Amino acid sequence: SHMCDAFVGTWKLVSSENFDDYMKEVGVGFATRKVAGMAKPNMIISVNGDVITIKSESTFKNTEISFILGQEFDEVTADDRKVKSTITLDGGVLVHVQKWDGKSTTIKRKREDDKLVVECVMKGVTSTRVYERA
Ligand SMILES: Oc1c(Cl)cc(C(O)(C(F)(F)F)C(F)(F)F)cc1Cl
């Protein structure tokens, strides 16, 4: 048993709050915000050795990242930002920082009861997205 066991699996979005405002703060344009805000993604998390894979799949976009904790990688986001990403575990929370154009946003994933809670923060704007097991 190990580092991310309680995150592994297939998760489905069940609620969102403040996501349009988060996307605005990040710089996402109108049409992408509308279509992305409608999305109901599945988040699929797996681990093989030290490599964690996170897939996000919806009618809007299918994306996938694989990474080792603490080890930076280049990522193209679903909104076509080219970012430098680092994901770490901080007291049981997966913390994903994305850097681009002198900006930064942080996405935190936490297990809470039977949910996986995702908090997306850009400056003073936070969005909370709740996922349940599929
Ligand atoms: O699945 C998704 C993933 Cl991985 C990422 C996004 C975004 O890139 C966000 F919010 F992260 F900035 C954006 F901009 F399109 F909204 C949205 C969905 Cl729905």
Side-chain angles (χ1 to χ4, degrees), residues 6-66:
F7 292 103
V8 163
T10 300
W11 301 92
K12 60 184 191 266
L13 182 71
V14 302
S15 68
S16 184
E17 282 294 353
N18 298 322
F19 191 59
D20 190 62
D21 280 345
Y22 170 78
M23 289 188 289
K24 284 184 168 180
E25 206 74 7
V26 167
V28 182
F30 179 92
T32 301
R33 293 198 314 279
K34 299 295 112 171
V35 174
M38 282 291 299
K40 303 291 192 155
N42 296 140
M43 182 191 20
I44 313 94
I45 301 176
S46 59
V47 176
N48 179 327
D50 296 333
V51 182
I52 304 165
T53 300
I54 303 177
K55 299 180 182 183
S56 182
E57 300 186 348
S58 75
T59 59
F60 164 60
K61 210 71 66 164
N62 297 332
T63 63
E64 171 180 331
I65 60 171
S66 293

